[PDB]
Amino acid sequence: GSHSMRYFYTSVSRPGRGEPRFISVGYVDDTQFVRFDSDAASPREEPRAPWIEQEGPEYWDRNTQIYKAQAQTDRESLRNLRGYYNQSEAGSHTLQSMYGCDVGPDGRLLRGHDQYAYDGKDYIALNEDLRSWTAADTAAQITQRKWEAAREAEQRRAYLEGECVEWLRRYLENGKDKLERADPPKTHVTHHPISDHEATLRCWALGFYPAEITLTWQRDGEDQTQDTELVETRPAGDRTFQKWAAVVVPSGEEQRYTCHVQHEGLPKPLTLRWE
Amino acid sequence: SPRWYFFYL
Amino acid sequence: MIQRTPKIQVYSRHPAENGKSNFLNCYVSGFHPSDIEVDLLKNGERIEKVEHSDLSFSKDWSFYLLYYTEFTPTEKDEYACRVNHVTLSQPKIVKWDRDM
Ligand SMILES: [Cl-]
Ligand SMILES: [Cl-]
Ligand SMILES: [Cl-]
């Protein structure tokens, strides 16, 4: 199937209390394999998956040096953003970065991603063409113009089309079955009486990987979006995921409703009923 | 591995 | 700036069975900014040596964390998650319901 590599950076300024906290996590698909945190005792890239532990000490030393430079870069990005938005120097602010590559089963690039948020809001994103920018507001336009003039997109394109793909391919080889697996959802429906005149149907999906899933209810084939309670997809702790969808139904009309599950691990989506 | 090109916003 | 209140789920890794070892989870997702306080409670008391995942975030830039501890459920032991966040006027306690 298809695969992604992503790095997620979080920087958080703390004025008068030293350098901003910088945290990176790295993912293949929904598997975290690395982390770096500037607050940790000896800040070092650390493994967080078994299949990346085989990398030698030079790999950890190298990535450590990279994150250390990244932390200083983000600190200066935060300084710059404060000016653009003309803000106090007294309060805390957040800069988030997300970048990586998607590859098809053939292992070639499908799509590169490179994008930023300031204080939880879109700031700037590299377009799918990897040659041009979408700025979220007039401040981001300042960043856009300096990046266009300096042709910094070309350097970002080289990482995403080149290295990003090579590292992902090597991590997929390292991981074998633990990354090429799709675990289908374990699915069932439970009935919970509310009154004489109403009952809750809860449709469950357990132990699925990857996290992407669609869980929906239908009344005789019709959408129940506004009448469906739907919990956020949640981790089990063992690198599988969980979800449920509930809908309050008039008692006796249970046969009218159907739960629909779509997941990579299901070639055909499931239709669960209550008879 | 993480990218070793850096960019100031 | 954007502030989003956490969504809180307290659940076990596996379907709970009295006397069988398991993992109690509190998942806090959808929150901003990133500072958050999460405790797991046994009969209203704070469990020690609780672990958490590394700060990460979703497509919408909102943060998520998993707090978890090994435990062996019993018929009588109650478990809860208590979350504090600048979006809350007071900490939110969500009880563990083994059916949920
Ligand atoms: Cl939720
Ligand atoms: Cl409790
Ligand atoms: Cl999202």
Binding positions of A are: 63, 84, 143, 146, 152, 159, 171
At A179, phi and psi to the nearest 5? -120, -30
Q: Do B9 and A143 touch (CB under 8 A)?
A: yes
C-alpha to C-alpha distances, A62 to A73, A147, A172, A236, C32, nearest whole angstrom: 17, 26, 20, 32, 31
For residue A168, the SS3 value is helix
If asked whether residues A134 and A25 sit together in one domain, one would say: yes
The span from the CA of A127 to the CA of A111, in Å, is 10
**Adjacent-strand bridge partners of C85:** none
Q: Which residues contact C88 (CB under 8 A, 6 or more apart)?
A: C5
Solving technique: X-ray
Q: Do C54 and A235 touch (CB under 8 A)?
A: no
Q: Which residues contact A212 (CB under 8 A, 6 or more apart)?
A: A263, A264
If asked whether residues A25 and A53 sit together in one domain, one would say: yes
**Which resolution, in Å, applies to this structure?**
2.4
Domain that holds residue C51: 1-100
CATH number for the domain harbouring residue A260:
2.60.40.10
Q: Which residues contact A33 (CB under 8 A, 6 or more apart)?
A: A26, A27, A47, A48, A49, A51, A52, A171
CATH number for the domain harbouring residue C8:
2.60.40.10
Instruction: Select from B3, B4, B5 the residue whose CB has the most chain A CBs within 10 Å, as the one to mutate to test that interface.
Output: B3
If asked whether residues A85 and A143 sit together in one domain, one would say: yes
Structure tokens at B3: 């990218």
Strands A257-262 and A270-272: antiparallel
CB neighbour class for A147 (10 Å; exposed up to 12, middle 13-18, buried from 19)? buried
Q: Do A121 and C1 touch (CB under 8 A)?
A: yes
If asked whether residues A37 and A168 sit together in one domain, one would say: yes
- Collect all residues of chain A within an 8 Å Cβ-Cβ radius of residue B9: 77, 80-81, 95, 116, 123-124, 143
Number of domains chain A is built from: 2
Q: Which residues contact A37 (CB under 8 A, 6 or more apart)?
A: A21, A22, A23, A24, A43, C54
Task: Give residue C30's region: left, alpha or beta (phi > 0; psi -120 to 50).
Answer: left
Candidate from C23, C27, C63 with C-beta closest to A234: C27
Compute the distance from residue C95 Cα to the ligand 2 centre, in Å.
7
Domain that holds residue A252: 186-272
